[PDB]
Design a protein around this ligand. Structure first.
Ligand SMILES: CC(=O)O[C@H]1C[C@@]2(C)[C@@H](C[C@@H](O)[C@H]3[C@@]4(C)CC[C@@H](O)[C@@H](C)[C@@H]4CC[C@@]32C)/C1=C(\CCC=C(C)C)C(=O)O
Ligand SMILES: CC(=O)O[C@H]1C[C@@]2(C)[C@@H](C[C@@H](O)[C@H]3[C@@]4(C)CC[C@@H](O)[C@@H](C)[C@@H]4CC[C@@]32C)/C1=C(\CCC=C(C)C)C(=O)O
Ligand SMILES: CC(=O)O[C@H]1C[C@@]2(C)[C@@H](C[C@@H](O)[C@H]3[C@@]4(C)CC[C@@H](O)[C@@H](C)[C@@H]4CC[C@@]32C)/C1=C(\CCC=C(C)C)C(=O)O
Ligand SMILES: [Co+2]
Ligand SMILES: [Co+2]
Ligand SMILES: [Co+2]
Ligand SMILES: [Co+2]
Ligand SMILES: [Co+2]
Ligand SMILES: [Co+2]
Lengths: 211, 211, 211
């Protein structure tokens, strides 16, 4: 299948996992600013647009860490071999959003192809889920406003291990262009170290060649 | 009455409403900084004080968007024709706060009259609710400290649709005076677009003549 | 014993306490930046390290306010005469953390002695709680990344009154070195005033001689 069962008994975090999954169930969010000064430059020298590029880079970073691709399947802890991004699309006409997903691909060009293709087919579709699989990552965008913090207050997040990432409008801060990015995870599968690792990797990706 | 029943069946967000009200119940908070450089100037040229003015302007912006004045009445979705601000009052003597409300009025002078009047009558009243109706907005102030984020962790927010707004101590950031403002809403009636719209409108109001 | 039963009937906040403990159960978090420009200087002129010093100063500030040392014992409201810090320790080897506590002491040198001693004995211990009493404060550190906000989403926090403090990586902001610090408390025992008071006291402590 496209997932492997995780060896929970020999895992270094097995105590932590039981602890934060059942003893003291919790998750946390954190908002940090990513420096997109370099990325903006690379975007400027290309035909790629900002949203699709950030989706790609967030999916890329996620795809690099097992702890960000865990799930409960058949009451067992698994790791997805790979996850596809699920992202929000605003409909200016109805002022409502939809959620769409498209297959992740390590080739940025093939990813762009997938993205346009999905966007092509459902741009007009106002259902909440126009498409109607489980190895996903959630990405949302609030481009109309800058924020220093964002937190989702969910009534029930039992065994909800997929990361939720929210980005705000970027802004010029001195000489840098900063993007606020909120990350919300479940404490059973992710510690603060794990989140900081993801953010630092994303920052390095933004600071690198697209191709 | 002072409210209208909302047409949920022909609403563009009907799916979203059921989704975030019962399928996946949730709300979110966001903190953004409002630029009060201009407002400070207008305040300086007037006899109005800061708190009462912000309450007025927050109530004014709210009063402009239906999605911020929704409620459940008799198991039905309604919109208040208008909401009155409910705001916190600190008692230096007991170091405790109270919550008071006063009628909103589009005339800033008449609003000030209402405010002083309520403050006059209960300044000495240490009960939590000295006054003892439901079309409200909640406004709170933390003037003693600056914050970049604020979030309320509520054990049960079922059908709780009124916005909660928290403001921190403002501060000088370069050439601007910024005020941190947290907004917490229920995802059944408000999307990120809706919150960004409110904040942008508030910013425009701060940047405009008081009268 | 090391705690006193609190006089809830003659307390100015008795209504607030019942209100936020049972009527509308809630807590809140807030992230603010502390200016550690001065502290860094004092650290530079000493042999003390950053983490142990912040733990000491956070415990010191806490130890100064009753509202931050409340608990439910035998279904009664009590105040701890003093609380000891419980702080996280990262294991680079396993990339996992542990929680340790050590006795608080108003003498910074004796505190350092306690700290080293605990760290000495369990540096190698990967259990979640290597040590296996209740008058504590929770301190956590995310030194690998800067954040503007941090919030813990806990499924059940009934009667959980001990403060939770999270610090991020500090950073240079103009001429100042700022440290992001998140504070999460229960609204039954703490108001926004109470949190601002703690943060302002901490800022003053950072800005003062160590000894
Ligand atoms: C795990 C879970 O409960 O996910 C639910 C919950 C879900 C993750 C949803 C997709 C999407 O709305 C998510 C966003 C980011 C949508 C936009 C914002 O409003 C966020 C506040 C929001 C939080 C969670 C939410 C609402 C879900 C799905 C979608 C499945 C896959 C596809 C392509 C539709 C799900 O059930 O699988
Ligand atoms: C909807 C609901 O549950 O509101 C409850 C909950 C309520 C909104 C309350 C008014 C006021 O404390 C609110 C503030 C901002 C008070 C100050 C802070 O501590 C906030 C953390 C807090 C959150 C919600 C709270 C505590 C309520 C009222 C008040 C009704 C109207 C008037 C004039 C008193 C209510 O029940 O109607
Ligand atoms: C009150 C309560 O429920 O505390 C539980 C919950 C607890 C406070 C825990 C100690 C420590 O993990 C705490 C940290 C900061 C640990 C690191 C992060 O992951 C935080 C997200 C986390 C939140 C709460 C938590 C997980 C507890 C203890 C510890 C008791 C004392 C000692 C020396 C071990 C407890 O039960 O007493
Ligand atoms: Co279990
Ligand atoms: Co791989
Ligand atoms: Co329903
Ligand atoms: Co109107
Ligand atoms: Co009770
Ligand atoms: Co003492």
């Amino acid at each position: 299948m496209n997932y492997t069962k995780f060896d929970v008994k020999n895992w270094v975090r097995r105590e932590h996992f039981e602890f934060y999954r059942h003893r003291l169930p919790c998750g946390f969010s954190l908002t940090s600013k990513i420096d997109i000064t370099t990325l903006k430059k690379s975007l400027d020298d290309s035909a790629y647009k900002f949203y699709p590029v950030m989706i790609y880079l967030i999916a890329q970073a996620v795809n690099q860490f097992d702890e960000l691709r865990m799930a409960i399947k058949d009451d067992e802890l698994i790791v997805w071999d790979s996850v596809d991004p699920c992202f929000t699309v605003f409909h200016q006409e109805t002022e409502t959003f939809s959620a769409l997903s498209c297959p992740y691909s390590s080739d940025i060009d093939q990813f762009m192809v997938n993205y346009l293709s999905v966007m092509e087919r459902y741009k007009s579709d106002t259902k909440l889920f126009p498409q109607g699989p489980e190895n996903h990552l959630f990405i949302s965008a609030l481009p109309w406003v800058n924020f220093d913090s964002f937190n989702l207050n969910v009534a029930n997040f039992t065994d909800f291990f997929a990361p939720v990432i929210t980005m705000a409008k970027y802004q010029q801060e001195g000489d840098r262009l900063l993007l606020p990015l909120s990350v919300q995870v479940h404490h059973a599968v992710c510690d603060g170290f794990h989140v900081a690792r993801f953010i630092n990797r994303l920052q390095e990706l933004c600071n690198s060649k697209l191709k």
